[model samples]
Target: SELLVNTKSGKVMGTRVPVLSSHISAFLGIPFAEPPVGNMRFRRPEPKKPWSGVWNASTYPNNCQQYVDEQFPGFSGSEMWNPNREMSEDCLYLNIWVPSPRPKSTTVMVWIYGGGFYSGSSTLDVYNGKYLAYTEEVVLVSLSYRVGAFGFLALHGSQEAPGNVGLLDQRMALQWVHDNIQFFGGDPKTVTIFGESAGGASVGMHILSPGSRDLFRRAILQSGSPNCPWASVSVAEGRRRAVELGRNLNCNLNSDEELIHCLREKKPQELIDVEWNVLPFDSIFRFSFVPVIDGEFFPTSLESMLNSGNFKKTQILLGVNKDEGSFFLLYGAPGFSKDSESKISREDFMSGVKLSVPHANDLGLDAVTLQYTDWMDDNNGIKNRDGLDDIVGDHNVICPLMHFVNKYTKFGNGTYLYFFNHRASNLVWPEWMGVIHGYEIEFVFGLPLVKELNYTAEEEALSRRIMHYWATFAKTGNPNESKWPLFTTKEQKFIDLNTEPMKVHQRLRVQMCVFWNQFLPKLLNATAC
Candidate 1:
């Protein structure tokens, strides 16, 4: 049966969608902000205009336009894992699924998808709120925002395009949930924002945002943090990117308004199709375009924010996979070693090492390489696959995340962290790859329940436990479970979400993290010993 309600936007309908024995009333393609087309491109989000008559919310909306250059929509399995049917510039709609047998005032989990701030859609099948809503008896939400040149193009000191339009879209959507979620049986006071990778980083940014202080009470960051090298761009460099884009597009770059209007007039595909000239791919921090420090939103660096204690406080759950780099390795070791069990070439290895060091030209490459591997040990670095994977994951995600954890723990924030070592049985890859980035998504969302997925009973159990922990956290800032441990500065205790045992562990990657936490900072500053 279809459900109808008079929302703040207008009269709307939610189709009754089934999940297992229970069902959820889904409100799909609901606009939270005005379309960012025309003059709106690359601008901060604005409130959605009111609609007339009954708005049929049963249909899903188009996802943001992505410069999709791969075999899949988002990533390899995204075409299968997500249900994103189409993409367009007019793609800022959000989706919601509330359990039919809903709780009086249920907790809400608002999800932000991760695609390196380039490509992702709430319409993706994986983001479907049915399983999470019905199984956890909580309201689930997913929203879409602009990406790539459309979302992240930046000009220094320009108020129009500050390089975080996508994040602003998220901020607006989150505020919408806080203002309107209560009408749909969700407690406005209790909200949890969760995501993997870029989304994880986005949640962290939201927490750091003063404007978002009243929106979300908690955050779950998987394999991302604002401290990650790729999370932010400087204003000066961002200006360079925007200028380059204008030059390539042959736009009137004399003024910011002309530049914006020129970009706006171009077709959506034309803008997306233009080759994105980000920093060279060698820099792991390289992104086509991303969140920039606009002196507003970001205001300054993350260290200054965390250290200054100027940001809002929120309970946080953050962690990275055992082999977060494995996911990135595929892109690096392509063509010759593409998807093969073969090792990448020496040229590739050196280039990666150079890129690994922020100022590789300044620091000694041998010193950096030695820390990652032991030439005296024979089977190390390029000769060893584990070492290769280690450097990638550690430098790119793991080490930066640990540094971020220290900031929160040192401040005595009620933060909980985890080590996602579990590889879902449904995954088609070999175990050698280890628990790569984004693997936990399947477990967290309980994808095993789908008849098509070939997941094991233990994996399904893990999913249920994660759902319980996440939902419980939304209800009350803490993930109320006996096994899931709270992190502290002393023990560095974290939960291992692997197997049914799910034990609490101390000093996860202690030695490697120690090296990274110490060396990476120096390397970036061109002062590595």
Candidate 2:
């Protein structure tokens, strides 16, 4: 069950994890970079040093410190999505799962987690890669990186604390995999980086990042893209938040170095405790400490990098869920909550729309309202609730992703798209929630195949099929072993993954996306700020 493996770092041992009928070797808690504590707090991660002897890699690692809420506002069980393990600042580890009787030229799948760039860890049970590795016979790897204030705290002109260190952590881990994955019976050149939400955005950012372009061969983005409003913070906003955070911490020094030094002295929780509202208006799409265009790492705006045709040219498989906003709106939307079954009024729906598009003037606001409104059932409370979901979903995830797909497909390599429509049977949320964000994660990781969860046979089959296509995509350049069509700027084809039948469709929510990506931008540009 135990095997010794040679890594560039040194010799390490992995333990066997049994899955269904087979087993896989799992190497957990392998440090990919030095701990970012003390003076290294907000700086980029340093490469891990080689160990002197065999290092044990069987135990789970500590997750990075994040704001763990006592009761997640949406669902009581939503806490399951939060980090459950012991979290610390000294958290920079990666886990690997290699199939037994390792196949030659094995495709490596690397995973990054998503929590709005503020929270998330790869150690979650749902993200466990053993099932995917055993069933798909591909090597799977998941890594931990800093989140929240620890990950992204940029002071403009401060060389010590350039933002996007979280992303740099991911980049370092990717370099580690590129240099050392062959030791785990995987091909270093045939690697694929896939993630959800913020992680998906990270994958897209990596595609645009010059520092990260050469680390992987293929990419998959689920329910996120770099263009997502919440994904990247403006440089001015980032610097402003960093100073505000310092003021909150009583480190109100004029110098960035002294301010950073003072911040380094405080505990991790103190930094996370500070509130955020970069904008005066409330919006579910606002994130405090996300990626910033800090010249060095990001170099330029996401749009500019994407349009330049100099970014990574790898194949991409990316998509968003049907109800991507249902989960977010449960907590952030004005009248919605996990317990509230009653629908919102027309005014409440308008309020929700305003929150999402706060900068839009009356005319732009009217356009957005008209765009998302269900004219046939304009008075129906249920329709209003659904409309709010569409507004949030399209603005935050779907539209941004489609915009990214349009740019990438124009000059990038083979691109495949998907729209997940299945809801899990085990979720405690109301049936009306539809397939909310992060729901497809369980199926992607094959969690339905777990016995005690009591997932249906159909669910297990669906899980396996998703894993098959996912692994197939990692193995080659395309997601289809069958007839799933490639996405193009012309056809704009995508697979509608649902329980009824996984079917290929064209132009999902084209009107809604066009409104957000094209019409709204033009409207906002013309409107006097």
Candidate 3:
């Protein structure tokens, strides 16, 4: 099948692929910006040059430079395999999938993959947009941006770089969509941006970003929050991390020109090796690469900005899983076990909780922990030892997320929040890790249709419903055609996307919310330890 797509450069013919015997047109690896190589490295993304000839977008561009963790223990998996594609500075590319027949007007969903801002590509198999385009009659798009040092490193004399080159790449991609989506049979004004984990956090940043306000109309944050640990770090801290990277690489940061040149000339694998060494455990200190709040791209503080009604116009759909922390516990810390004597004691758990979320006072932390523990109890008694870990994780991650919902709802914006409780078959340690982070991605994207996953017919129905809600929200700001109540301070009602759609009161652990909300301000103001 052949179709015409109008791009900023000019009209191009896009070919259609058969999915489950249904025809869906696709345009892949279209450049959105000039490569960020040579002098372009560490700089804001620049617009791509127009070509007179029709550009082939059938394949994915090389992913950003990333480290393969062979030396780094506990990093082996299907997700960590980095294909040996060409690495270039000029690698800002976007892919599109649209219904072959083409609708008069269609919702456009832009997906941003999450690898803690260091690793991920739009070309990943899990992110293929065929089902979403054909099933929902929506236009699906994904893009590749700078990552790791090239995308997010903030060095000393690099005040000119201003950080967040990855985010700038995202912004440039959205701009490309806005300027050229009409040719692909999508309504630019109806675009919705959504992502999981780091991507979700990026969506939240986009909401707070004045630069990103008009690029997309609606946003979805899946299993990630803007208030994650790294998002709150200061520019000074970001530069400190970069300096540490320079030290590890044996480069002198005092000479900005030489340092930049050395870094640019360094082999991609060498850089990855250095990064892995720095962050062997993949903890907040090491494994992840994330966007920093440079006081420009991400503003003063996400909490402050949300409270000030900076995102009054943006519609939001946000949620996290029942056991988000287990992913970190299992992956970030290798030794945590059910039979281990060194279980996370309540005191240790609360200590880390208070350190991370300083607003939670002793009383508040105690109250919140007690409430969650009690809720975990069945007819006989508290379910298992892992209950405490679940509560800790929820308090640390979900509590701050609810704070975002509460603040945004108070500002009078349409906000919908959900808790994913359905456990997939491939759960990390099913007994310990119930519905972990990134599990919901397959469900949200209808991956069960193509890939094998443990989904009952009822669960499959829920996935389809979620896809509809996502696409519908992207098309229209209102998620529900019926009576989906706007989130409000008076009654924080959110639709629970479970086996059965139920209107439930906000089930957030309130004490945790209060504790984090109170202590977060001071934590944000503090210098990195």
- All models, RMSD in angstroms: 2.5, 1.7, 4.5
The lDDT per prediction is 0.76, 0.86, 0.69
Q: List the residue pairs that clash in candidate 1.
A: 82-125, 83-124, 83-125
Model 2, runs deviating above 4 Å: 73-76, 275-280
Per-residue lDDT, model 1, residue 153, is 86
How accurate locally is residue 36 in candidate 3, as Cα lDDT from 0 to 100?
A: 80
Worst 10 residues of 2 by lDDT: 275-284
lDDT of 1 by residue, 442-502 (tens): 7788787776676777777888888888888777778884657788878889988877587
Compared with the true structure, model 3 gives a TM-score of 0.86
The runs of at least 3 residues in candidate 1 whose Cα sits more than 4 Å from the true structure, single-residue gaps closed, are 69-78, 81-83, 334-338, 345-347, 362-364, 377-383, 523-529
Q: lDDT tens digits, residues 1-529, model 3?
A: 3566667775556677878567888888788888787767778888888876677766667777765334334533334335435665556888899897877768899998877677777776668788888888999998778877778877534743557888999999999999988878889998899988778878887888888988988899887777765443466766666666767788867766666666766766666667645432223212334577777786677767877887636678888777777655544343344334334545444443343334444555455455545443422112323554454465546776887777777764588877787776544343566666777787788766654555677777877888888887888877775455666766777666667665575656565556555644444444233
Best by TM-score: 2
Candidate 1, TM-score vs. the true structure? 0.93
User: In terms of lDDT, which candidate is stronger, 1 or 2?
Assistant: 2
Tens digits of per-residue lDDT for model 2 on 148-234? 989988886787888899999999999999999998888999999999999999999999888889899999999999889888877
The local distance difference test score of model 1 is 0.76
